[PDB]
Amino acid sequence: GAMPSIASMIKGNKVVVFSWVTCPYCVRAEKLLHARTKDITVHYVDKMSEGEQLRGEIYQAYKHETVPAIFINGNFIGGCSDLEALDKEGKLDGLLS
């Protein structure tokens, strides 16, 4: 909307992730991301006083609030399940270039 937030962070690395330290799905992603590349950044929005704004940027655009939220060259990936669904098909290896 009119007030800039997380949408700028997605341009500063090839892979960008938003996790919670307490979540298991966070770890399912963080494990596989370090297995497939070295070009990943992650933010822990449970450790962040503005984390409800960073969640609001995802919910106002995509009506979802479950973690991790995952991004690759500005394209959207709904979770570790949505990431692995491209790993299982050989298509994530074509995205990560």
JSON list of C-alpha atoms in Angstrom, two decimals, residues 6-82:
[
{"chain": "A", "resi": 6, "resn": "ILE", "atom": "CA", "xyz": [9.09, -6.03, 3.41]},
{"chain": "A", "resi": 7, "resn": "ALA", "atom": "CA", "xyz": [8.50, -5.82, -0.41]},
{"chain": "A", "resi": 8, "resn": "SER", "atom": "CA", "xyz": [11.92, -4.03, -0.74]},
{"chain": "A", "resi": 9, "resn": "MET", "atom": "CA", "xyz": [13.82, -6.84, 1.11]},
{"chain": "A", "resi": 10, "resn": "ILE", "atom": "CA", "xyz": [12.90, -9.38, -1.65]},
{"chain": "A", "resi": 11, "resn": "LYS", "atom": "CA", "xyz": [15.17, -7.51, -4.19]},
{"chain": "A", "resi": 12, "resn": "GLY", "atom": "CA", "xyz": [18.35, -7.60, -1.98]},
{"chain": "A", "resi": 13, "resn": "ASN", "atom": "CA", "xyz": [18.89, -11.43, -2.16]},
{"chain": "A", "resi": 14, "resn": "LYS", "atom": "CA", "xyz": [18.07, -14.29, -4.60]},
{"chain": "A", "resi": 15, "resn": "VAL", "atom": "CA", "xyz": [16.13, -16.23, -1.88]},
{"chain": "A", "resi": 16, "resn": "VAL", "atom": "CA", "xyz": [14.32, -14.39, 1.00]},
{"chain": "A", "resi": 17, "resn": "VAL", "atom": "CA", "xyz": [12.40, -16.11, 3.88]},
{"chain": "A", "resi": 18, "resn": "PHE", "atom": "CA", "xyz": [10.17, -15.02, 6.81]},
{"chain": "A", "resi": 19, "resn": "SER", "atom": "CA", "xyz": [10.13, -17.62, 9.68]},
{"chain": "A", "resi": 20, "resn": "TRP", "atom": "CA", "xyz": [9.41, -17.94, 13.44]},
{"chain": "A", "resi": 21, "resn": "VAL", "atom": "CA", "xyz": [12.17, -19.47, 15.67]},
{"chain": "A", "resi": 22, "resn": "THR", "atom": "CA", "xyz": [9.44, -21.54, 17.48]},
{"chain": "A", "resi": 23, "resn": "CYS", "atom": "CA", "xyz": [7.95, -23.10, 14.28]},
{"chain": "A", "resi": 24, "resn": "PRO", "atom": "CA", "xyz": [8.84, -26.59, 12.91]},
{"chain": "A", "resi": 25, "resn": "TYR", "atom": "CA", "xyz": [8.04, -25.64, 9.24]},
{"chain": "A", "resi": 26, "resn": "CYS", "atom": "CA", "xyz": [10.61, -22.83, 9.54]},
{"chain": "A", "resi": 27, "resn": "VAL", "atom": "CA", "xyz": [13.28, -25.55, 10.24]},
{"chain": "A", "resi": 28, "resn": "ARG", "atom": "CA", "xyz": [11.96, -27.82, 7.40]},
{"chain": "A", "resi": 29, "resn": "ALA", "atom": "CA", "xyz": [12.69, -24.89, 5.02]},
{"chain": "A", "resi": 30, "resn": "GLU", "atom": "CA", "xyz": [15.96, -23.58, 6.67]},
{"chain": "A", "resi": 31, "resn": "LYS", "atom": "CA", "xyz": [17.45, -27.11, 6.38]},
{"chain": "A", "resi": 32, "resn": "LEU", "atom": "CA", "xyz": [16.62, -27.60, 2.67]},
{"chain": "A", "resi": 33, "resn": "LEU", "atom": "CA", "xyz": [17.54, -24.01, 1.67]},
{"chain": "A", "resi": 34, "resn": "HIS", "atom": "CA", "xyz": [21.08, -24.51, 3.07]},
{"chain": "A", "resi": 35, "resn": "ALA", "atom": "CA", "xyz": [21.15, -27.94, 1.27]},
{"chain": "A", "resi": 36, "resn": "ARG", "atom": "CA", "xyz": [20.27, -26.43, -2.20]},
{"chain": "A", "resi": 37, "resn": "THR", "atom": "CA", "xyz": [22.06, -23.00, -2.09]},
{"chain": "A", "resi": 38, "resn": "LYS", "atom": "CA", "xyz": [24.31, -20.46, -0.27]},
{"chain": "A", "resi": 39, "resn": "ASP", "atom": "CA", "xyz": [22.23, -17.49, -1.63]},
{"chain": "A", "resi": 40, "resn": "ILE", "atom": "CA", "xyz": [19.48, -17.36, 1.09]},
{"chain": "A", "resi": 41, "resn": "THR", "atom": "CA", "xyz": [18.51, -14.68, 3.69]},
{"chain": "A", "resi": 42, "resn": "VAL", "atom": "CA", "xyz": [15.89, -15.17, 6.46]},
{"chain": "A", "resi": 43, "resn": "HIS", "atom": "CA", "xyz": [14.11, -12.85, 8.96]},
{"chain": "A", "resi": 44, "resn": "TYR", "atom": "CA", "xyz": [12.59, -14.15, 12.25]},
{"chain": "A", "resi": 45, "resn": "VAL", "atom": "CA", "xyz": [9.37, -12.08, 12.60]},
{"chain": "A", "resi": 46, "resn": "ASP", "atom": "CA", "xyz": [8.62, -13.62, 16.04]},
{"chain": "A", "resi": 47, "resn": "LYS", "atom": "CA", "xyz": [11.74, -11.74, 17.37]},
{"chain": "A", "resi": 48, "resn": "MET", "atom": "CA", "xyz": [10.48, -8.45, 15.80]},
{"chain": "A", "resi": 49, "resn": "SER", "atom": "CA", "xyz": [8.22, -5.73, 17.38]},
{"chain": "A", "resi": 50, "resn": "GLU", "atom": "CA", "xyz": [7.06, -4.88, 13.79]},
{"chain": "A", "resi": 51, "resn": "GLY", "atom": "CA", "xyz": [6.39, -8.61, 12.89]},
{"chain": "A", "resi": 52, "resn": "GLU", "atom": "CA", "xyz": [2.59, -7.99, 12.65]},
{"chain": "A", "resi": 53, "resn": "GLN", "atom": "CA", "xyz": [3.30, -5.34, 9.92]},
{"chain": "A", "resi": 54, "resn": "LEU", "atom": "CA", "xyz": [5.53, -7.82, 8.01]},
{"chain": "A", "resi": 55, "resn": "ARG", "atom": "CA", "xyz": [2.66, -10.41, 8.38]},
{"chain": "A", "resi": 56, "resn": "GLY", "atom": "CA", "xyz": [0.20, -7.66, 7.24]},
{"chain": "A", "resi": 57, "resn": "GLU", "atom": "CA", "xyz": [2.19, -7.19, 3.97]},
{"chain": "A", "resi": 58, "resn": "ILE", "atom": "CA", "xyz": [1.68, -10.94, 3.22]},
{"chain": "A", "resi": 59, "resn": "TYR", "atom": "CA", "xyz": [-1.98, -11.05, 4.37]},
{"chain": "A", "resi": 60, "resn": "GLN", "atom": "CA", "xyz": [-3.18, -7.89, 2.45]},
{"chain": "A", "resi": 61, "resn": "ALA", "atom": "CA", "xyz": [-1.56, -9.25, -0.79]},
{"chain": "A", "resi": 62, "resn": "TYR", "atom": "CA", "xyz": [-2.03, -13.09, -0.48]},
{"chain": "A", "resi": 63, "resn": "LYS", "atom": "CA", "xyz": [-4.61, -13.64, 2.42]},
{"chain": "A", "resi": 64, "resn": "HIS", "atom": "CA", "xyz": [-2.16, -15.94, 4.30]},
{"chain": "A", "resi": 65, "resn": "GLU", "atom": "CA", "xyz": [-0.30, -15.68, 7.64]},
{"chain": "A", "resi": 66, "resn": "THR", "atom": "CA", "xyz": [1.29, -19.18, 8.21]},
{"chain": "A", "resi": 67, "resn": "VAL", "atom": "CA", "xyz": [5.13, -19.47, 8.26]},
{"chain": "A", "resi": 68, "resn": "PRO", "atom": "CA", "xyz": [7.54, -19.78, 6.54]},
{"chain": "A", "resi": 69, "resn": "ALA", "atom": "CA", "xyz": [6.71, -17.33, 3.75]},
{"chain": "A", "resi": 70, "resn": "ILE", "atom": "CA", "xyz": [9.28, -17.89, 0.95]},
{"chain": "A", "resi": 71, "resn": "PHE", "atom": "CA", "xyz": [10.33, -15.77, -2.08]},
{"chain": "A", "resi": 72, "resn": "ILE", "atom": "CA", "xyz": [12.65, -16.40, -5.11]},
{"chain": "A", "resi": 73, "resn": "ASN", "atom": "CA", "xyz": [13.55, -13.50, -7.51]},
{"chain": "A", "resi": 74, "resn": "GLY", "atom": "CA", "xyz": [10.36, -11.69, -6.27]},
{"chain": "A", "resi": 75, "resn": "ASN", "atom": "CA", "xyz": [8.13, -14.77, -7.07]},
{"chain": "A", "resi": 76, "resn": "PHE", "atom": "CA", "xyz": [5.93, -16.20, -4.23]},
{"chain": "A", "resi": 77, "resn": "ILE", "atom": "CA", "xyz": [6.31, -19.64, -2.52]},
{"chain": "A", "resi": 78, "resn": "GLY", "atom": "CA", "xyz": [3.57, -20.44, 0.08]},
{"chain": "A", "resi": 79, "resn": "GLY", "atom": "CA", "xyz": [5.68, -22.64, 2.45]},
{"chain": "A", "resi": 80, "resn": "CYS", "atom": "CA", "xyz": [8.16, -25.54, 2.79]},
{"chain": "A", "resi": 81, "resn": "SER", "atom": "CA", "xyz": [5.48, -27.80, 1.18]},
{"chain": "A", "resi": 82, "resn": "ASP", "atom": "CA", "xyz": [5.21, -25.41, -1.86]}
]
